[PDB]
Amino acid sequence: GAMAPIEYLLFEEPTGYAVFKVKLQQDDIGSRLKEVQEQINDFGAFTKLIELVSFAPFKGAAEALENANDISEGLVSESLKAILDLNLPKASSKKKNITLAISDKNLGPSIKEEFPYVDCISNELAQDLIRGVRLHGEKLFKGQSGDLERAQLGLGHAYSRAKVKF
Amino acid sequence: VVIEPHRHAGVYIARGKEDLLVTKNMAPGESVYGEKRISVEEVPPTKVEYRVWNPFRSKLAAGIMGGLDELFIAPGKKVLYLGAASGTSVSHVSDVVGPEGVVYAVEFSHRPGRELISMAKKRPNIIPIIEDARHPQKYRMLIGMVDCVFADVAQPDQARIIALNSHMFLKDQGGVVISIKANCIDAETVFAREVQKLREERIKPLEQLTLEPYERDHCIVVGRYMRSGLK
């Protein structure tokens, strides 16, 4: 339907999934996008715009690779189904739908198939907010410099080796 | 042999019989693709090994030899390298960014990609990504935000590839360093059109250099990503 504000946001870390609540007030957000985009670059200002609801770590390297493969193909794994099932408010008679920022439009239909009351959003504001999570990384998570990068190293090797049959 | 610092941090000049462009080897004793290694002495004297960076064999080295003012690749930087091939140029980018930096090295073809993975095993600051750079959502779990996107893709649709990857991963005010081989896309008209496509993706051109005498009809372009739009 008509443009509804983004309420939640999904970010796929190499170490697990994160669901954030979007706190940014989005009245006439188009007239303020440049100002919001500048806020996103500063960690302190960004904390006004989003807040972590839940981070669900993968159990280990094998599950991480399964999820890297599922996400690369726009699929909803059992781990992604779980974090969305547990941390997105359920539809009710007083609040009928929930909006979720995702960066990959092709993941949307897979999410909606599991959660028909979720409307996925991948517009410029969604992309800007996701960039902000990508930028500020570990500072957003209770439990360090390198943690995510170390995990990307192992996961990138695992993903690539599976492709080339190593 | 005497080592002199290049204008660009992480790059050096080895002064001897010949003056050679070199990087400091992150995997001492290991050559990646047959390039010469030079050990310089500086309790036994300490030895530091450098690797020759031949501008005839690497588009980025050719650009550096032409006198790029801003490289955006430097110690500690995170670099998204599109068109990583077997890892020859990537190995030098890895030397430049050092232990505090990271090179995300994207290559679609499996024959070179297998060699890229193999060489990356010896360099923990390289993340090898064997995937199609036209579909950056596919590897978003593997990449953070980067300070520079370098592209040596030689594809007709490389402008869109560069754009999609910059919008997902390139910091605001980050750099774009692109090799443009007109033949794989007159040369001056092609260069101008590709640079215009960059402008349309919020990338402000800063410098444009020929790669002569190292390459024919190639042009390296440096730009700055303006996330909120060109000012």
Short mmCIF file of C-alpha atoms in Angstrom, two decimals:
data_model
loop_
_atom_site.label_atom_id
_atom_site.label_comp_id
_atom_site.label_asym_id
_atom_site.label_seq_id
_atom_site.Cartn_x
_atom_site.Cartn_y
_atom_site.Cartn_z
CA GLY A 1 0.00 0.00 0.00
CA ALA A 2 1.06 3.57 0.72
CA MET A 3 4.51 4.23 2.15
CA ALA A 4 4.57 3.03 5.74
CA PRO A 5 7.46 3.82 8.11
CA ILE A 6 10.15 1.21 8.73
CA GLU A 7 9.65 -0.38 12.15
CA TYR A 8 12.34 -3.09 12.35
CA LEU A 9 15.53 -3.98 10.52
CA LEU A 10 17.34 -7.24 9.76
CA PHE A 11 21.12 -7.45 9.54
CA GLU A 12 23.03 -10.62 8.66
CA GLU A 13 26.36 -10.71 10.47
CA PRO A 14 28.97 -13.37 9.67
CA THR A 15 28.42 -14.52 13.27
CA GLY A 16 24.60 -14.50 13.39
CA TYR A 17 21.40 -12.59 12.73
CA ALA A 18 20.48 -9.29 14.36
CA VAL A 19 17.03 -7.69 14.64
CA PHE A 20 17.00 -3.94 15.35
CA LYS A 21 14.12 -1.64 16.23
CA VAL A 22 14.05 1.48 14.05
CA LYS A 23 13.45 4.53 16.24
CA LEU A 24 13.87 7.17 13.53
CA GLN A 25 10.74 9.29 13.17
CA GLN A 26 9.87 9.21 9.48
CA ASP A 27 7.48 12.11 8.88
CA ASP A 28 8.43 13.59 5.49
CA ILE A 29 11.68 11.64 5.63
CA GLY A 30 12.37 12.51 2.00
CA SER A 31 12.90 16.17 2.90
CA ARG A 32 15.44 15.14 5.56
CA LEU A 33 17.30 12.22 3.96
CA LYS A 34 20.57 14.14 3.58
CA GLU A 35 20.48 15.11 7.27
CA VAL A 36 19.70 11.54 8.30
CA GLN A 37 22.46 10.23 6.04
CA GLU A 38 24.92 12.49 7.85
CA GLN A 39 23.69 11.31 11.27
CA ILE A 40 24.24 7.68 10.26
CA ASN A 41 27.99 8.27 9.83
CA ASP A 42 28.43 9.20 13.53
CA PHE A 43 28.01 6.35 16.01
CA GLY A 44 26.55 8.59 18.73
CA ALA A 45 23.92 10.09 16.45
CA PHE A 46 23.13 6.67 14.95
CA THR A 47 22.09 5.35 18.37
CA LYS A 48 19.08 7.67 18.08
CA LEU A 49 17.97 5.92 14.89
CA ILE A 50 18.11 2.22 15.82
CA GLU A 51 18.48 -0.10 18.78
CA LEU A 52 19.30 -3.79 18.96
CA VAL A 53 16.43 -6.09 19.90
CA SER A 54 18.24 -9.43 19.63
CA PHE A 55 21.45 -10.93 18.29
CA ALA A 56 21.28 -14.69 17.72
CA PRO A 57 24.74 -16.21 17.10
CA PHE A 58 25.19 -19.18 14.81
CA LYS A 59 26.10 -22.34 16.73
CA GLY A 60 29.35 -22.78 14.81
CA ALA A 61 31.12 -22.65 11.48
CA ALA A 62 28.90 -25.24 9.77
CA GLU A 63 25.68 -23.39 10.59
CA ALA A 64 27.29 -20.08 9.61
CA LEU A 65 28.18 -21.46 6.18
CA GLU A 66 24.69 -22.95 5.71
CA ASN A 67 23.28 -19.51 6.45
CA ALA A 68 25.77 -17.70 4.20
CA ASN A 69 24.60 -20.03 1.43
CA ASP A 70 20.89 -19.55 2.21
CA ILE A 71 21.22 -15.77 2.41
CA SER A 72 23.23 -15.71 -0.82
CA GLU A 73 20.23 -17.43 -2.47
CA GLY A 74 17.49 -15.37 -0.81
CA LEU A 75 16.32 -18.24 1.41
CA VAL A 76 15.08 -18.24 5.01
CA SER A 77 16.97 -20.76 7.15
CA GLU A 78 15.69 -22.22 10.41
CA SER A 79 17.92 -19.74 12.26
CA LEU A 80 16.46 -16.75 10.39
CA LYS A 81 12.92 -18.05 10.86
CA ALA A 82 13.67 -18.35 14.59
CA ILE A 83 14.99 -14.83 15.20
CA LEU A 84 12.10 -13.30 13.24
CA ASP A 85 9.54 -15.53 14.99
CA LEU A 86 10.84 -14.61 18.44
CA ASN A 87 11.64 -10.91 18.03
CA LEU A 88 9.17 -9.39 15.62
CA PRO A 89 5.92 -8.53 17.42
CA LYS A 90 3.09 -10.79 16.31
CA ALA A 91 0.22 -9.37 14.30
CA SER A 92 -2.84 -8.53 16.40
CA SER A 93 -6.27 -6.98 16.00
CA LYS A 94 -4.78 -3.62 17.07
CA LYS A 95 -1.63 -3.74 14.88
CA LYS A 96 -2.12 -5.72 11.68
CA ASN A 97 1.28 -5.61 9.93
CA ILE A 98 4.98 -5.04 10.67
CA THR A 99 7.56 -3.43 8.37
CA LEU A 100 11.09 -4.85 8.15
CA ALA A 101 14.09 -3.29 6.45
CA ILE A 102 16.15 -5.80 4.42
CA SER A 103 18.92 -5.10 1.93
CA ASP A 104 18.09 -7.94 -0.52
CA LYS A 105 14.72 -7.52 -2.22
CA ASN A 106 14.84 -11.19 -3.25
CA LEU A 107 14.78 -12.30 0.40
CA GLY A 108 11.46 -10.48 0.88
CA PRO A 109 9.15 -13.04 -0.72
CA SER A 110 10.86 -15.82 1.25
CA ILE A 111 10.28 -13.97 4.54
CA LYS A 112 6.66 -13.15 3.68
CA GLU A 113 5.99 -16.82 2.89
CA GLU A 114 6.95 -17.65 6.48
CA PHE A 115 5.51 -14.44 7.98
CA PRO A 116 2.62 -13.18 5.84
CA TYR A 117 2.04 -10.17 8.13
CA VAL A 118 5.56 -8.77 7.48
CA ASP A 119 6.10 -6.16 4.77
CA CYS A 120 9.75 -6.04 3.74
CA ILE A 121 11.26 -2.69 2.75
CA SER A 122 14.45 -2.24 0.74
CA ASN A 123 14.22 1.43 -0.30
CA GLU A 124 16.99 4.02 0.07
CA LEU A 125 16.26 4.70 3.75
CA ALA A 126 16.35 0.97 4.51
CA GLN A 127 19.67 0.70 2.66
CA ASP A 128 21.06 3.71 4.56
CA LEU A 129 20.10 2.24 7.92
CA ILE A 130 21.60 -1.14 7.01
CA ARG A 131 24.81 0.61 5.92
CA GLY A 132 24.87 2.20 9.36
CA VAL A 133 24.76 -1.19 11.06
CA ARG A 134 27.45 -2.42 8.67
CA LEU A 135 29.54 0.66 9.51
CA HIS A 136 29.29 0.70 13.31
CA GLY A 137 29.43 -3.07 13.79
CA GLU A 138 30.53 -4.39 17.14
CA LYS A 139 29.88 -1.07 18.89
CA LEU A 140 26.20 -2.02 18.51
CA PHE A 141 26.59 -5.41 20.26
CA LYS A 142 27.46 -6.21 23.87
CA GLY A 143 30.25 -8.68 23.15
CA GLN A 144 35.47 -6.07 19.66
CA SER A 145 37.74 -4.70 16.94
CA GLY A 146 38.32 -7.66 14.62
CA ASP A 147 35.59 -10.01 15.87
CA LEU A 148 33.45 -9.50 12.77
CA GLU A 149 36.47 -9.29 10.46
CA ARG A 150 37.92 -12.52 11.87
CA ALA A 151 34.55 -14.19 11.29
CA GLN A 152 34.34 -12.85 7.72
CA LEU A 153 37.77 -14.36 6.96
CA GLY A 154 36.75 -17.87 7.94
CA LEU A 155 33.30 -17.56 6.39
CA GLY A 156 34.59 -16.15 3.11
CA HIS A 157 37.08 -18.98 2.75
CA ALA A 158 34.32 -21.48 3.56
CA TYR A 159 31.88 -19.93 1.09
CA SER A 160 34.46 -19.70 -1.68
CA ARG A 161 35.91 -23.18 -1.15
CA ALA A 162 32.41 -24.66 -1.43
CA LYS A 163 31.92 -22.84 -4.75
CA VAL A 164 35.17 -24.02 -6.33
CA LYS A 165 34.87 -27.54 -4.81
CA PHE A 166 37.77 -27.33 -2.36
CA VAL B 1 69.89 -1.87 -2.08
CA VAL B 2 68.34 1.19 -0.40
CA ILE B 3 64.61 1.44 0.34
CA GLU B 4 62.97 4.84 -0.06
CA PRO B 5 59.36 5.56 0.94
CA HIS B 6 57.04 6.31 -1.94
CA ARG B 7 54.72 9.28 -1.66
CA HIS B 8 51.98 6.73 -0.95
CA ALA B 9 52.14 5.02 2.43
CA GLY B 10 52.78 1.30 2.22
CA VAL B 11 54.53 1.69 -1.15
CA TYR B 12 58.30 1.91 -1.52
CA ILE B 13 61.10 2.35 -4.04
CA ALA B 14 64.01 -0.10 -4.09
CA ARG B 15 67.10 1.78 -5.30
CA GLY B 16 69.85 -0.41 -6.75
CA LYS B 17 70.99 -1.29 -10.25
CA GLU B 18 67.43 -0.34 -11.24
CA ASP B 19 64.87 1.70 -9.34
CA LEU B 20 61.91 -0.59 -8.67
CA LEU B 21 58.47 -0.11 -7.17
CA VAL B 22 58.05 -2.53 -4.26
CA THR B 23 55.75 -3.45 -1.40
CA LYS B 24 56.71 -4.93 1.96
CA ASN B 25 56.00 -8.65 1.87
CA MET B 26 53.28 -9.77 4.31
CA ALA B 27 54.40 -13.39 3.76
CA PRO B 28 58.21 -13.18 3.74
CA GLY B 29 59.97 -15.74 1.57
CA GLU B 30 56.80 -16.30 -0.47
CA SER B 31 56.46 -15.05 -4.03
CA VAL B 32 52.91 -15.07 -5.36
CA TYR B 33 53.44 -15.08 -9.13
CA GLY B 34 57.19 -15.28 -9.78
CA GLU B 35 57.94 -11.66 -8.85
CA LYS B 36 61.38 -10.86 -7.47
CA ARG B 37 61.88 -10.62 -3.72
CA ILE B 38 64.51 -8.23 -2.35
CA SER B 39 65.85 -8.55 1.19
CA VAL B 40 67.29 -5.41 2.80
CA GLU B 41 69.39 -5.46 5.97
CA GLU B 42 68.28 -2.92 8.58
CA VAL B 43 73.03 -9.38 17.34
CA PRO B 44 72.35 -10.22 13.68
CA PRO B 45 71.01 -7.39 11.49
CA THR B 46 67.28 -7.55 10.86
CA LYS B 47 66.09 -8.35 7.34
CA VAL B 48 62.92 -6.97 5.72
CA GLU B 49 61.72 -8.47 2.44
CA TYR B 50 60.06 -6.46 -0.32
CA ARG B 51 58.37 -7.65 -3.51
CA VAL B 52 58.76 -6.01 -6.91
CA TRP B 53 55.50 -4.52 -8.23
CA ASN B 54 55.76 -4.45 -12.02
CA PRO B 55 53.52 -1.75 -13.57
CA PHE B 56 53.37 -3.72 -16.83
CA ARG B 57 51.69 -6.56 -14.89
CA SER B 58 49.31 -4.60 -12.64
CA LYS B 59 46.92 -1.79 -13.60
CA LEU B 60 47.11 -0.28 -10.11
CA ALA B 61 50.91 -0.17 -10.19
CA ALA B 62 50.69 1.51 -13.61
CA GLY B 63 48.40 4.13 -12.08
CA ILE B 64 50.81 4.73 -9.20
CA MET B 65 53.66 5.18 -11.68
CA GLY B 66 51.61 7.85 -13.45
CA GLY B 67 51.44 9.90 -10.26
CA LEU B 68 48.00 9.45 -8.73
CA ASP B 69 47.53 12.10 -6.06
CA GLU B 70 45.06 10.06 -3.95
CA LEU B 71 45.18 6.27 -3.78
CA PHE B 72 42.68 5.54 -0.96
CA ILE B 73 44.64 2.30 -0.47
CA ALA B 74 47.02 2.64 2.46
CA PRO B 75 47.99 0.94 5.73
CA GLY B 76 44.92 0.06 7.80
CA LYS B 77 42.42 0.59 4.99
CA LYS B 78 39.62 -1.81 4.10
CA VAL B 79 39.54 -2.35 0.33
CA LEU B 80 36.91 -4.04 -1.83
CA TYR B 81 38.82 -5.33 -4.88
CA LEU B 82 36.59 -6.30 -7.81
CA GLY B 83 38.24 -8.38 -10.53
CA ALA B 84 40.75 -10.06 -8.25
CA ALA B 85 41.68 -12.74 -10.83
CA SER B 86 44.43 -15.01 -9.42
CA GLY B 87 45.49 -12.46 -6.79
CA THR B 88 48.62 -10.90 -8.31
CA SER B 89 47.64 -7.24 -7.82
CA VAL B 90 45.60 -8.13 -4.72
CA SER B 91 48.77 -9.50 -3.11
CA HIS B 92 50.35 -6.05 -3.35
CA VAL B 93 47.20 -4.33 -2.05
CA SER B 94 47.44 -6.78 0.86
CA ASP B 95 51.06 -5.71 1.43
CA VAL B 96 50.02 -2.05 1.37
CA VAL B 97 47.09 -2.25 3.80
CA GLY B 98 49.08 -4.48 6.15
CA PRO B 99 47.94 -6.34 9.25
CA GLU B 100 45.50 -3.57 10.26
CA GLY B 101 43.75 -3.52 6.86
CA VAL B 102 41.63 -5.98 4.88
CA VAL B 103 41.25 -6.79 1.20
CA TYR B 104 37.92 -8.26 0.14
CA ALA B 105 38.90 -9.89 -3.16
CA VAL B 106 36.01 -10.70 -5.51
CA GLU B 107 36.53 -12.91 -8.58
CA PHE B 108 33.87 -14.78 -10.53
CA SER B 109 35.99 -17.23 -12.56
CA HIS B 110 36.93 -20.48 -10.84
CA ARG B 111 40.28 -21.21 -12.51
CA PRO B 112 41.83 -17.95 -11.26
CA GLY B 113 39.59 -18.05 -8.19
CA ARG B 114 41.19 -21.29 -7.01
CA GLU B 115 44.60 -19.61 -7.22
CA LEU B 116 43.21 -16.57 -5.37
CA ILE B 117 42.05 -18.80 -2.49
CA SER B 118 45.42 -20.56 -2.38
CA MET B 119 47.42 -17.36 -2.14
CA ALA B 120 44.97 -15.92 0.39
CA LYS B 121 45.70 -18.84 2.72
CA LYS B 122 49.12 -17.26 3.37
CA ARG B 123 47.73 -13.73 3.91
CA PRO B 124 45.11 -13.48 6.68
CA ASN B 125 44.20 -9.92 5.65
CA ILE B 126 42.65 -11.19 2.38
CA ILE B 127 39.07 -12.48 2.28
CA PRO B 128 38.63 -14.39 -1.02
CA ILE B 129 35.10 -14.15 -2.43
CA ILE B 130 34.37 -16.34 -5.48
CA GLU B 131 31.06 -14.85 -6.65
CA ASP B 132 29.54 -12.60 -9.33
CA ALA B 133 30.14 -8.94 -8.44
CA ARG B 134 26.90 -8.14 -10.31
CA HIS B 135 25.07 -9.63 -7.28
CA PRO B 136 26.66 -8.10 -4.17
CA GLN B 137 23.74 -9.16 -1.98
CA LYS B 138 25.13 -12.68 -2.37
CA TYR B 139 28.30 -11.93 -0.36
CA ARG B 140 27.09 -9.14 1.96
CA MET B 141 27.67 -11.40 4.96
CA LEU B 142 31.38 -11.47 4.05
CA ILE B 143 32.07 -7.72 3.81
CA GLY B 144 31.98 -4.77 6.19
CA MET B 145 32.15 -1.12 5.19
CA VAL B 146 35.21 -0.32 3.10
CA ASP B 147 37.35 2.75 2.53
CA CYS B 148 37.96 2.06 -1.16
CA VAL B 149 36.44 0.11 -4.03
CA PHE B 150 39.03 -0.87 -6.64
CA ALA B 151 37.70 -2.32 -9.88
CA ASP B 152 39.64 -4.04 -12.68
CA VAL B 153 36.68 -5.85 -14.19
CA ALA B 154 36.90 -5.19 -17.92
CA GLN B 155 33.19 -5.80 -18.48
CA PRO B 156 30.78 -3.72 -20.60
CA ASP B 157 28.44 -3.35 -17.59
CA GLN B 158 31.22 -2.65 -15.09
CA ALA B 159 29.72 0.76 -14.26
CA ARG B 160 26.64 -0.92 -12.77
CA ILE B 161 28.82 -3.50 -10.99
CA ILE B 162 30.89 -0.73 -9.41
CA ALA B 163 27.76 1.20 -8.43
CA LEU B 164 25.96 -1.73 -6.80
CA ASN B 165 29.01 -2.63 -4.73
CA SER B 166 29.71 0.97 -3.71
CA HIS B 167 26.14 1.55 -2.56
CA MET B 168 26.26 -1.57 -0.39
CA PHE B 169 29.78 -1.40 1.07
CA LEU B 170 31.60 1.89 0.42
CA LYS B 171 31.79 4.42 3.22
CA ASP B 172 30.55 7.93 2.58
CA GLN B 173 33.57 9.93 1.37
CA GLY B 174 35.31 6.66 0.50
CA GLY B 175 37.28 6.18 -2.68
CA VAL B 176 36.65 4.53 -6.03
CA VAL B 177 39.67 3.57 -8.15
CA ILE B 178 38.65 2.10 -11.50
CA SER B 179 40.59 0.79 -14.48
CA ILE B 180 38.75 1.46 -17.74
CA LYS B 181 39.87 -0.58 -20.77
CA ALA B 182 37.95 1.13 -23.55
CA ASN B 183 38.13 -1.89 -25.86
CA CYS B 184 36.23 -4.19 -23.47
CA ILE B 185 33.40 -1.66 -22.96
CA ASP B 186 36.97 5.98 -29.73
CA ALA B 187 38.65 5.58 -26.34
CA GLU B 188 38.25 9.19 -25.18
CA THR B 189 34.50 9.04 -25.85
CA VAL B 190 34.16 5.77 -23.92
CA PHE B 191 36.18 7.12 -20.98
CA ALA B 192 33.95 10.21 -20.81
CA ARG B 193 30.74 8.15 -20.87
CA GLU B 194 31.91 5.77 -18.13
CA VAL B 195 33.00 8.69 -15.95
CA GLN B 196 29.53 10.16 -16.46
CA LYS B 197 27.92 6.92 -15.29
CA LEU B 198 30.02 7.26 -12.13
CA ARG B 199 28.64 10.76 -11.56
CA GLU B 200 25.12 9.35 -11.92
CA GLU B 201 25.93 6.94 -9.06
CA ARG B 202 27.06 9.72 -6.67
CA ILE B 203 30.79 9.26 -7.40
CA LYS B 204 32.66 12.53 -7.94
CA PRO B 205 35.61 12.14 -10.33
CA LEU B 206 38.88 13.45 -8.89
CA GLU B 207 41.62 12.37 -11.32
CA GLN B 208 41.90 10.52 -14.62
CA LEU B 209 45.26 9.18 -15.83
CA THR B 210 46.38 7.24 -18.87
CA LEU B 211 48.29 4.02 -18.23
CA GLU B 212 50.68 4.70 -21.10
CA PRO B 213 53.40 3.58 -21.55
CA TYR B 214 52.39 0.47 -19.59
CA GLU B 215 49.04 -0.09 -21.33
CA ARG B 216 47.35 1.09 -24.51
CA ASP B 217 43.90 2.74 -24.40
CA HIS B 218 43.49 2.26 -20.65
CA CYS B 219 42.46 4.97 -18.21
CA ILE B 220 42.51 4.82 -14.41
CA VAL B 221 39.89 6.99 -12.71
CA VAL B 222 39.83 8.02 -9.05
CA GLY B 223 36.62 9.31 -7.52
CA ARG B 224 35.01 10.03 -4.16
CA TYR B 225 31.69 8.50 -3.10
CA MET B 226 29.18 11.14 -1.94
CA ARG B 227 26.45 9.07 -0.29
CA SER B 228 24.05 12.04 0.08
CA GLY B 229 24.71 13.10 -3.51
CA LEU B 230 27.16 15.27 -5.40
CA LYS B 231 27.42 18.68 -3.72
#
